[PDB]
Paper text:
Membrane-bound pyrophosphatases (M-PPases) are homodimeric primary ion pumps that couple the transport of Na+- and/or H+ across membranes to the hydrolysis of pyrophosphate. M-PPases are large (66–89 kDa), single-domain integral membrane proteins comprised of two identical monomers, each with 15–17 transmembrane helices. The helices of each subunit arrange into an inner ring (helices 5, 6, 11, 12, 15, 16) containing the functional core (active site, coupling funnel, ion gate, exit channel) and an outer ring (helices 1–4, 7–10, 13, 14) of largely unknown function. To date, H+-pumping (H+-PPase), Na+-pumping (Na+-PPase) and dual-pumping (Na+,H+-PPase) M-PPases have been found, most of which require potassium (K+) for maximal catalytic activity.
To address them, we solved the first structure of a K+-independent M-PPase (from the thermophile Pyrobaculum aerophilum, PaPPase), performed enzymatic assays on native PaPPase and three variants (A12.46K and A12.49T, and the double mutant), and conducted both electrometric and time-resolved crystallographic studies on TmPPase, a K+-dependent Na+-PPase. The PaPPase structure is in the Mg5IDP-bound state with loop closed and a structural water located at the ion gate. In our new structure, the E5.71-R13.62-R/I/Kˈ10.33 interaction is lost: the cytoplasmic regions of helices 13–14 are straightened, resembling resting state and product-bound structures despite having IDP bound. Our PaPPase:Mg5IDP structure provides the first data on the ion gate set-up of K+-independent H+-PPases with E6.53 and shows that the 3D orientation of ion gate residues D6.50, S6.54, N16.46 and E6.53 in particular all resemble the structure of VrPPase:Mg5IDP, a H+-pump with E6.57, and not TmPPase:Mg5IDP, a Na+-pump with E6.53, despite the shift of the semi-conserved glutamate. We modelled SO42− from the crystallisation solution to mediate the inter-subunit communication of Y10.44, Y13.44, and R15.40 in PaPPase:Mg5IDP, but this may be Pi (not present in crystallisation) under physiological conditions. For K12.46, this indeed places ε-NH3+ of K12.46 at the K+-binding site, which would explain K+-independence.
Numbering used by the authors:
A (entry chain A): 6 to 30, 35 to 76, 83 to 202, 209 to 282, 286 to 403, 408 to 508, 516 to 577, 582 to 715
B (entry chain B): 6 to 30, 35 to 76, 83 to 281, 286 to 403, 408 to 508, 516 to 577, 582 to 715
The structure:
């Protein structure tokens, strides 16, 4: 069913129009909702503009680097994600006023389903775009250039990661640089300062756009890495045709996931995502045995491996939901610490962030470990079996992210409720209706953390699969064998490998701490900019929002190239100056440190944010107790949405440039495996 | 010259009495100095009491586990460090009042040398105790039981690490649980500056100061001096190199004791004198080591200089970390003012950016420890049975480097007692309302000490990073000995980084450290709350205006802190054991990998930021010197990085280091449970 990948995929626009026309179904509410669009307009118009500049130049560079041709698949790969991004962005800006007007007089359900449908637009679209764009080029290359046709479409992944890197560090900086600069100049969502629109425009850039594009990396890298695996091993094409079927059902499981046909409490979100998976699993178990014929133990192995990747997601949902929701303790543990002081709640609110990372880690290892076994016992040398093992882990990581559609649907429901939460406080809407937007926002805050777990954890499984894929790229370049030398050259105790593991964990500090000082300083350029305008005339009686948008992006994107390119070079220099061993260690320590830390922060930031919401509804005042809880908010605030989610686009892309330069780096090493 | 290692060592305690009697050379000033002693008394009396309980029980267990005998060296090994601790404890309690009275009327020099002399007591003694304690049992075991006599004396390291674990997690908790409980009750209920006499937390804090950096840190570094000499000597023995190397290293260490005996001698102006002496206390050691090294031992000119070059790389890195942390930690330098100025905005903004300058302060240390062992790896590889026989000459070149780095520990611990002793004086002056100017100079000695304690965390942790790979190779030969009753062919191809259990372990190793630190953070944060409540019950009874009570606050904090200690302490012992047996030795090899990969960068990330927030407070606390919205922000950052500075940062290092020390003890016990050479179940 290779051709079928396009059939159901193109229905994304078919179904995105349904939800788009669903959202398209006040004076002050319209201007602010329209302001989010104009702000997001100048953002994307300027973000895609410079984005295409570097894409075409590098697409021209990749065209000569491949010389068949691959820059063509390189280009559309990036265009696919951005297309689903522009589709979901125009929805979020309009939802801010839609869900606000719907919730106030309709009830809690009206808000939950409206803000949820606005998110189903992006989730189902992007997932649809990913499947059809690879299945389209997969079938084209399948018949076009035999003998490793899957590799050409794999460059579609690299070009698509370059753009997710763009908005994660760019949108991540902008999302928090505005949230930070707007919050403290007020000391929230007060109309006096223009930072309220720059923040909410950031909300759609941090979690709606920046995060949704990030997970696009998960859906594209594993399908290209998993297909690339089954090819390089020499296994039958039965494996490659089954994975495309599992993916299509995930689109079917996410097409059904978003129906949500009586809403009561915000638990409805977790239940649907929970059963949107089982509906996929058993439908996958059953459709898997239908299209392909394999020995019963081997065919279920595919259904069992992907079932392990799909199940882990609801588990991370229930975990982060526990450590993040104010309904549950670990949030009240720190919110109560507000009575003492901010420093004391900081350290202990930091603490419960650490212990919130180990449960996710405990699952991702046990989950891929079981998939490794089942895939190893079911499906030329001792490695040929071991490779069947790491492939069992590839199937797991693939199964995890193929259901990405349902999770991104939630990363747009959270911020859209954040937008609604802003619309009500600045427009001074009724107390009750402006409070429910906050709980929808606090539930959304539990969602963004859940997706960061879903995003980062899925990356951890791919790294070891990308490791093996990187090897076959250094084996191919070595011949122009290596298996006998690299195996005994990359044992963890080798000189380059251990140093790299320290430079990989040291590089991530230099990358994240460079981002933190940048976002913190560019925000100061927003804080300074506000004074420039507010000093001229009084903010009582009101371009101005477009100014804060354009100034913050070009200053944020300006810094982006510094760490973004610095994170590109330092691995390259170590990869060539020391060797591929050094980068293998650099990518090891990075994946080993990045996955736990980003969880430590992704969860803690959400906890401090939800901790404020819990006391901001009870306290709901400027009390020395609440003032302390706000300090914890803005600390974990940018570290939550800027550096936390950036380790994932670093780790995954960190193996994505090394594999493209294995031919370029191995020839520079002038040796098979070196420690000098 | 193996016997000489003991001769000069015992002269350290002989010489330590000179400075101890030198420091021993007012009414309100006398009671507080004696109160620190009674507090340190009830602390050590209760710490050594339970410390001997588990030591004897396990010493009896180790006696049957070895069945020659090795529990004897197990006992004295731990006793050596504690002896240098009790010598420095009685010194620090007396220095609080001594240095205060000396600085006020003599000048800045009088204070700088007195608080420094009080530290030379601990530094020179402990380093002396370490050298004589190993050369003593080394020479005894060299002639007692040939054929792997070095292994029995290696058990001296584990037993000594078990207790350094005691005070790092225990003293670390106590130091910040008291520092925390005393600080916040002054701002929330009392409304007074820290180190104020009204609340009993002022004595509990300063008593903690001597336990966090003076005792907890100095005892921790004893782990560095003991583990590498046993691991490096164990390497040269197991590697098959000539005994010429084993006799030379004992001389280099003695030279370091001579280079540190001269280091403490110390015209005075700015606290830069500390960095200059510690910088030149190394070169004086290096060239003196270069010179005495060629005299006693004969080796090929290129091969003999290799020893002087390898250890010279371990010795030079320390002053480099000193100048690095001194830059990121001292208010004299930028990165501190970067955040102190952010106090004008808000605490959250200075928190995030004060956190930032902590991260980039970790990459310079990492950049050096890798370059240093890499060059030693090369020089040791090209100078000194299979492809491994040459490669092992490399990691041993790294062992010599790690050995060379920590043999100069004496000069650094001398500084870990100068920092808090100035903190003690800093407290003595503000509560006794001593002259403004002289109580301000104690603060600069306190802020300079803050520049010292962070430097030692770098010095402590970095030396551990080089030893880890040495401990990896040493643990391998312990599983090779148990496997035969070959492994080279199986483990090499069984522990390549992509193995199933190894990668899982690397995630469980970095995950376990979170479970250990966040369990420690919640404990110290909650047990401190047991101190805050304790103050109220006593302060509620009678007014704190007009003053047993100090002995209670000491006794209550220890039994509650030590009570929690067993939870992470034993949990950190088990979880590696479970992974080592449930999954295999591959899993623990990965668990110890991810731990060293996260611990070395993490502990630096925190040790430096915590020190920066404290020094950031100091710069604005003298200019502002008031309760200003600007100063309040710098205090919030202080107490955040405050416990993360002295509890989690310095406890990760004794976790990783002890993790390779317990796993090597179970190589015989864990490999038989795995029921396979290398498996990924
Ligand atoms: Mg906010
Ligand atoms: Mg927001
Ligand atoms: Mg908001
Ligand atoms: Mg929020
Ligand atoms: Mg926020
Ligand atoms: Mg303090
Ligand atoms: Mg202190
Ligand atoms: Mg103090
Ligand atoms: Mg201090
Ligand atoms: Mg302190």
């Amino acid at each position: 069913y290779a051709l079928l990948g396009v059939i159901l995929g193109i229905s994304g626009v078919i179904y995105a129009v349904y939800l788009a026309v669903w959202v398209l179904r006040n004076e002050k509410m319209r201007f602010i909702s329209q302001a989010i669009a104009t702000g997001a307009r100048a953002y994307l118009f300027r973000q895609y503009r410079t984005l295409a500049v570097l894409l075409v130049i590098l697409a021209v560079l990749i065209l000569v680097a491949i010389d068949g041709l691959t820059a063509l698949a390189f280009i559309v790969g990036a265009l696919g994600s951005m297309l689903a991004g522009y589709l979901g962005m125009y929805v979020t800006t309009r939802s801010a006023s839609r869900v606000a007007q719907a919730a106030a007089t309709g009830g809690m359900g009206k808000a939950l389903l409206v803000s949820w449908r606005a998110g189903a637009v992006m989730g189902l679209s992007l997932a649809s775009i990913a499947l059809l764009l690879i299945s389209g080029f997969y079938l084209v290359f399948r018949s076009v250039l035999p003998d490793d046709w899957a590799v050409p479409l794999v460059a579609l992944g690299f070009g698509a990661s370059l753009v997710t890197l763009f908005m994660r560090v760019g949108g991540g900086i902008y999302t928090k640089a505005a949230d930070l600069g707007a919050d403290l100049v007020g000391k929230e969502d007060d109309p006096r300062n223009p930072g309220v629109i720059a923040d909410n425009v950031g909300d759609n850039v941090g979690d709606v756009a920046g995060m949704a594009a990030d997970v696009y990396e998960s859906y594209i890298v594993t399908v290209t890495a998993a297909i690339f695996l089954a090819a390089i091993l020499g296994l039958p094409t039965q494996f490659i045709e089954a994975i495309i079927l599992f993916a299509a059902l995930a689109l079917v499981a996410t097409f059904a996931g978003v129906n949500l046909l009586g809403v009561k409490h915000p638990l409805s979100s977790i239940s649907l995502a929970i059963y949107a998976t089982i509906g996929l699993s058993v439908v996958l178990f059953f459709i898997g045995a239908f299209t392909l014929g394999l020995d019963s133990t081997k065919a279920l192995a595919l259904a069992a491996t992907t079932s392990l990747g799909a199940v882990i997601a609801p588990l991370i949902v229930k975990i982060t939901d526990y450590y993040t929701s104010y309904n549950y303790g670990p949030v009240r543990k720190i919110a109560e610490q507000a009575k003492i002081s901010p420093a004391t709640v900081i350290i202990t609110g930091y603490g419960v962030g650490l212990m919130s990372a180990i449960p996710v880690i405990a699952v991702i290892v046990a989950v891929l470990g079981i998939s490794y076994m089942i895939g190893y016992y079911t499906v030329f040398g001792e490695l040929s079996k071991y490779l069947a093992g790491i492939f069992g882990t590839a199937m797991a990581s693939v199964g995890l992210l193929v259901v990405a559609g349902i999770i991104i649907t939630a990363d747009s429901y959270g911020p859209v409720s954040d937008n609604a939460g802003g619309v009500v406080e600045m427009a001074g809407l009724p107390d009750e209706v402006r409070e429910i937007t906050d709980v929808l926002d606090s539930v959304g805050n539990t969602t963004k953390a859940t997706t960061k777990g879903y995003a980062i954890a899925s990356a951890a499984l791919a790294a070891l699969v990308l490791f093996i894929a990187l090897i076959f790229e250094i084996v191919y370049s070595a011949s122009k064998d290596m298996i006998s030398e690299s195996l005994s050259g990359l044992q963890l105790i080798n000189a380059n490998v251990l140093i790299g593991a320290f430079l990989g964990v040291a590089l991530v500090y230099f990358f994240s701490s460079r981002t933190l000082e940048a976002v913190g300083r560019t925000a100061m350029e927003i804080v300074e900019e506000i004074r420039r305008q507010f000093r001229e005339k009084p903010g009582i009686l009101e371009p101005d929002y477009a100014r804060v948008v354009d100034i913050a992006t070009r200053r944020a994107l300006g810094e982006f190239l510094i760490p973004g390119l610095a994170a590109i070079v330092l691995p390259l220099i170590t990869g060539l100056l020391l060797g591929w061993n050094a980068l293998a260690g650099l990518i090891m320590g990075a994946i080993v440190a990045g996955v736990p830390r980003a969880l430590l922060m992704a969860n803690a930031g959400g906890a401090w944010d939800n901790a404020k919401k819990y006391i901001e509804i009870q306290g709901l005042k400027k009390t020395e107790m609440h003032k302390a809880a706000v300090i914890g908010d803005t600390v974990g605030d940018p570290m939550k949405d800027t550096v936390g989610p950036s380790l994932n686009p670093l780790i995954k892309v960190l193996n994505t440039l090394s594999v493209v330069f294995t031919y370029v780096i191995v020839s520079t090493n002038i040796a098979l495996g070196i420690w000098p």
